[PDB]
Amino acid sequence: HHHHHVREEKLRLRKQIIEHMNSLSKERYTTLSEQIVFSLYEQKEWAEAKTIGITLSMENEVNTYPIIEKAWKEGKRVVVPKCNKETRTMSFRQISNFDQLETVYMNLREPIPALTEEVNADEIDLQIVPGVAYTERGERIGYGGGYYDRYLVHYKGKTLSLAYSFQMVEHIPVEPFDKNVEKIITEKGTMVKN
Ligand SMILES: Nc1ncnc2c1ncn2[C@@H]1O[C@H](COP(=O)(O)OP(=O)(O)O)[C@@H](O)[C@H]1O
Numbered sequence: 457h458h459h460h461h462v463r464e465e466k467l468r469l470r471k472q473i474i475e476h477m478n479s480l481s482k483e484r485y486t487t488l489s490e491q492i493v494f495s496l497y498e499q500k501e502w503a504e505a506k507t508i509g510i511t512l513s514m515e516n517e518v519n520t521y522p523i524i525e526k527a528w529k530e531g532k533r534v535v536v537p538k539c540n541k542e543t544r545t546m547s548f549r550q551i552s553n554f555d556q557l558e559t560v561y562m563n564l565r566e567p568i569p570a571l572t573e574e575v576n577a578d579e580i581d582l583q584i585v586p587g588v589a590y591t592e593r594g595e596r597i598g599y600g601g602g603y604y605d606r607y608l609v610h611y612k613g614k615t616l617s618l619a620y621s622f623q624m625v626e627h628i629p630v631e632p633f634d635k636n637v638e639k640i641i642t643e644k645g646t647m648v649k650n
Pocket residue numbers: 466596597598599600601602603605606609633634
């Protein structure tokens with residue numbers, strides 16, 4: 457229960473799940489990503505959202521590119537974050553096409569400020585929240601920046617996360633600032649806060 461025990465457990469779990477994700481075959485990535493998103497589009501909060509906030513997936517993370525395409529097809533407004541590393545804040549900005557993105561390093565894609573419009577949190581109906589590991593309780597370990605933990609303080613709309621079932625864990629050592637998500641969709645079903 458010492459502070460280091462907590463931080464070391466988070467790094468340990470983050471490391472272990474990332475390693476597992478990276479080991480996923482191409483077949484598993486493709487099939488599981490397909491299943492998870494098919495289940496997303498059946499959700500009431502998808503159908504009803506007129507503006508959706510989402511991240512651009514990397515490596516073997518559940519594939520969000522098809523989700524953005526579907527949202528565009530359905531006439532939904534799509535917003536993606538630009539992170540400010542100094543303030544640890546996110547500016548969700550609308551994208552109508554993938555040419556409004558730039559690579560802000562190696563594999564990390566963000567909306568080009570000059571070509572995109574910031575959208576206020578109170579205008580975003582659903583936030584699809586990225587992450588590394590989760591519990592049945594909606595608890596969440598991300599990548600270590602604490603961006604969503606900070607953002608979710610002021611965001612009052614609906615939240616959900618997409619996850620492979622192996623990203624589900626029994627216990628996460630949550631700190632007072634860790635924010636939970638309302639729903640998790642895996643290839644096996646959904647975990648909901650009631
Ligand atoms: N609401 C907040 N206000 C201030 N600092 C925060 C807040 N939320 C998270 N942090 C900080 O962000 C850092 C990373 O958060 P952490 O929970 O460890 O990562 P993650 O949520 O990405 O898995 C921690 O050092 C923590 O102090």
